[model samples]
Target: PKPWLGAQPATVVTPGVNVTLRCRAPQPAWRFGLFKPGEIAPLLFRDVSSELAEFFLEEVTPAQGGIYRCCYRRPDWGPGVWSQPSDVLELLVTEELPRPSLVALPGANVSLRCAGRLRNMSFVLYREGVAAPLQYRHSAQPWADFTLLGARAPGTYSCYYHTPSAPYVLSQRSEVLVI
Candidate 1:
């Protein structure tokens, strides 16, 4: 099922200015909440009430400049349904690059230890700010490491892999914390 709302805005107003947000539910009775990056425990979203389903930024600043996502968990039955995720919502003045913690190893010696969410995917070895095509597997049936032909960035890098299929939508940027 589709998520209650799309990716929330990363940047919507000037810092320290009051800003408001809206969470468009897929259904009428569906309840929603917001989660900032690296945070757990869904906070009571009184800033955005159920009737309005919106949040306001009274004083937007650098701290609020991060990935802001919307989640919808039903309070109906034992473990109500949760909708699929929305597109990546990024904020901040600079390009908040995906801190892909996993990186491709060096040459035939280096291997990708981090398993991506999708399969049969095309990978981009993003380093600093540039991206290069990496070895990719074109199947979704098996778990495999799409190796790179050459030593793609001998240092730390991030991985952004994608595929052209239903299950293989886009990869959560992996932090290439190389050795």
Candidate 2:
């Protein structure tokens, strides 16, 4: 039987926060192992008594951020048979940023807005195929709004916001907005 593994908060969490990683199996299993990418050994193990095993990460740090996978095995499975590894969970540890929304305005202007927990945030706008940010906006409120003027070209765009204290910690990229 195949088992599925998942992260509680999905992706991109702030540093020093607790996160739960869960592994679930369809059938009864004897043992479960949680594996992170590029590791020779499993990060954690659990003796399965239920369908799911929860691995608690207390005060997560940047060092624990990576892709993780999990698997399970039954005792009666003879020698080398084990459940297939679960889907890779790309656990990103960074700032607690939210996805922003993009809107088209009159006269070739585009507006981007980000509403999230952190107030007085700063935002960065990125255009498709551009390595550097197209624009930056500093806000004093909980939300940030940026207007791109003369954005008449046909391309894609996205934006992310970050706090001043952890400037390097960025939120996940917003959904792609097409022109």
| Residue 144, model 2, lDDT | 63
Tell me the spans in candidate 1 whose CA falls farther than 4 Å from its real position. 4-12, 43-52, 93-179
C-alpha TM-scores of all predictions: 0.41, 0.57
Q: Which candidate leads in TM-score?
A: 2
The true-versus-predicted C-alpha distance at residue 111 of model 1, in Å, is: 39
TM-score of 2: 0.57
Candidate 2 — which residues are off by over 4 angstroms? Answer: 96-159, 162-179
| Backbone clash count for every predicted candidate, in the order shown | 13, 0
Instruction: Give, for candidate 1, the lowest lDDT window spanning 10 residues.
Output: 92-101
Residue by residue across 85-147, what tens digits does model 1's lDDT show? 444454442222223245343454556644554334455554554555544445453233544
Overall lDDT per candidate, in order of appearance: 0.49, 0.74
| Per-residue error (Å), model 2, residue 94 | 1.9
